[PDB]
């Protein structure tokens, strides 16, 4: 507003009007200067309206630009995170067993539900009570999915280590069921 010369025109018109009023100018000159001051102030506020629109749309454009830059610098982060997750999952794969079962496929296509069941090297058995434990994986080795597994660890629901001697019929009340047993393919 003050940068534009409309303020300068308003200020010089007001100064001339005040000077002539103090100097006792005639009524016709007084009305002439009043009209000139009125049109100068009219131009001043009219361009101040354009300045209001300028600053408003400039702030809106700046906020939009900040938001777009933020949403574009947050897209690259999630793209990199997804890429790292996918490549780590690639590196986790049991490549030889998966290659065997996928070359045995006629079309190259296999059900997903058999991918762990035939290639996973580690089995987690979650057991709710002692009778189930005795049924499924009693002893240090057991059979599941037509394979042989050897118990490598047992933990309780509290993620505390449990020894195979502590899983008994009388020590069952003292164990935080369920028990998660981790076994490796033999």
């Amino acid at each position: 507003f003050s940068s534009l010369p409309s303020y300068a025109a308003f200020a010089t018109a007001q100064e001339a009007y005040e000077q002539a009023v103090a100097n006792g100018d005639s009524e016709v000159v007084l009305k002439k200067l009043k009209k000139s001051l009125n049109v100068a102030k009219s131009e001043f506020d009219r361009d101040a309206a354009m300045q209001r629109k300028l600053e408003k749309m400039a702030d809106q454009a700046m906020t939009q630009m900040y938001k777009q830059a933020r949403s574009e610098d947050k897209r690259a982060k999630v793209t990199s995170a997804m890429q790292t997750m996918l490549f780590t999952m690639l590196r986790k794969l049991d490549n030889d067993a998966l290659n065997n079962i996928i070359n045995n496929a006629r079309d190259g296509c296999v059900p997903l539900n058999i991918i762990p069941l035939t290639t996973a090297a580690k089995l987690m058995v979650v057991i709710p009570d002692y009778n189930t434990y005795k049924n499924t994986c009693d002893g240090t080795t057991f059979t599941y999915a037509s394979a042989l597994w050897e118990i490598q660890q047992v933990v309780d629901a509290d993620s505390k280590i449990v020894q195979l001697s502590e899983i008994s019929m009388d020590n069952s009340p003292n164990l935080a069921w369920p028990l998660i047993v981790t076994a490796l393919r033999a």
Partner: protein, 590 residues
Amino acid sequence: AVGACVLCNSQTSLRCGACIRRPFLCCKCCYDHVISTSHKLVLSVNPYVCNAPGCDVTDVTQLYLGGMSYYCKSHKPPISFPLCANGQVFGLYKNTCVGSDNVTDFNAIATCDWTNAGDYILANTCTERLKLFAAETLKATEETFKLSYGIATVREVLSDRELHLSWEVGKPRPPLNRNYVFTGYRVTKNSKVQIGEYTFEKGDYGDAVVYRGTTTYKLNVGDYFVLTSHTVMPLSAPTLVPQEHYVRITGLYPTLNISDEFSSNVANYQKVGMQKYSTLQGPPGTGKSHFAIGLALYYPSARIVYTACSHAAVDALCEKALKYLPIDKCSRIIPARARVECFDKFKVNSTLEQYVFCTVNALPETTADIVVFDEISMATNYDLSVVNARLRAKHYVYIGDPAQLPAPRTLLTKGTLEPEYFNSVCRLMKTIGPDMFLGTCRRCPAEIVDTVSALVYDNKLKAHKDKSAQCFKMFYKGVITHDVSSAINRPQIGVVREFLTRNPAWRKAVFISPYNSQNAVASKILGLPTQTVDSSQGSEYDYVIFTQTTETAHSCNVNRFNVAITRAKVGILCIMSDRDLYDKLQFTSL
């Protein structure tokens, strides 16, 4: 995306879209770049174009934004305002942008086309964040320049070891060696894809190629060859990490019974282990290839990454480290595409080993204890920034002689780039001097080594040998044919075969030439193993023959002469054309 301005490092979100590299630019810096040069396109988080139904205005000094878009003057709303005003270009972080008056050289960096000599000389003395940008845009310019080339194909199936060449008409053809590789395109009917890369080399006569293959997939005529104008990634690491000294050697623990072979360099080994980065310039044939092995034997338990610009130097270093260093804890890292006949003698390609040898282009992002860069004359600033980005190590050692030949530097055609501005490291070696320098030359005869020390050097070289009395220098005319992109001297080989019968020594010689066409034709009529003047500089030989084809400023380049005549050890037949080149040196007349 936001980033840092190139010449003031303030936060910004603009970009000079007309530039090849599109560098970030702060507000005041972007205004100073656009009002001065002819780049009038600026890319913000959205491109600064005219978002009208029909109109296409790219200039930014003639764009006014309104509402939520940018239009020209014929499509703007009743509201204002200029995008490019008050000394600034409207972008993010408008009041954190500090101007800088180093745009007066950023204009010359961004707008030049590298045709003249001065572009390199002012693309190397600028600041660091412009040292990187100039190298990046130079590499981009070279890559785009290799896109205007004489695409070819194979005429028809001709041999299992050799193909033929059917080029297009009206376009130049590249040099042919292991450096220039070529790509086949399978646009057959049906879906252009890649089958494999072949490198090419001139044939015996007429039109033929004796090649080097990448993939076994044998094409019909359905493929045509281009020159793999690949992409250039941006570079971020500085050319040279800051020089910080250490009191006593850190992370490097000296050895027991290193050898009685190289025990005179123990002071230089420890001076290598002292600073952050060290510089060793050794005149041709003074043991820098052997100094690397000695350094590896002076700090026995430190993993060392050897690196070089080209396969020849790194392969010679690999062979020496096989001959001296322990062998099983070695690992040469080969490219997956295998554009060269690579080196398979070690337990190859295990990046988690101790002595890791590699090329600059194929370095994997890893860490080391002390990394030895070799042939810094060959390396451009891009290679230095790459080796600083991919490799983090406690010590860096740059070895190489700036008096040898520079990089190809294909774009340069007018004027001579003096050695000082080959790269940052050669500038260091000429400004203050190499930190280490070994001046006793162990390859050349007496007269040649004394005269080479008196040719350009400030008389600092000598030989621990006697002169073998089998180096010569003749003046035989050697009529020129030159009916190919380079000059050839066949009847000079005629004169040399008029000799070479009373001289049974060199009958296993390596042929060198100042022109790749004569080098290619010299391996055809007589099967001399060849090695170009560029492919030298890092290996030693005892039988080498070198002829001069022409007489010009490319024939009197004393850097090339010094890198040529210092690869033989006991015998060289050589052809001199100019009386200048017969009189700076002492040899028998015949």
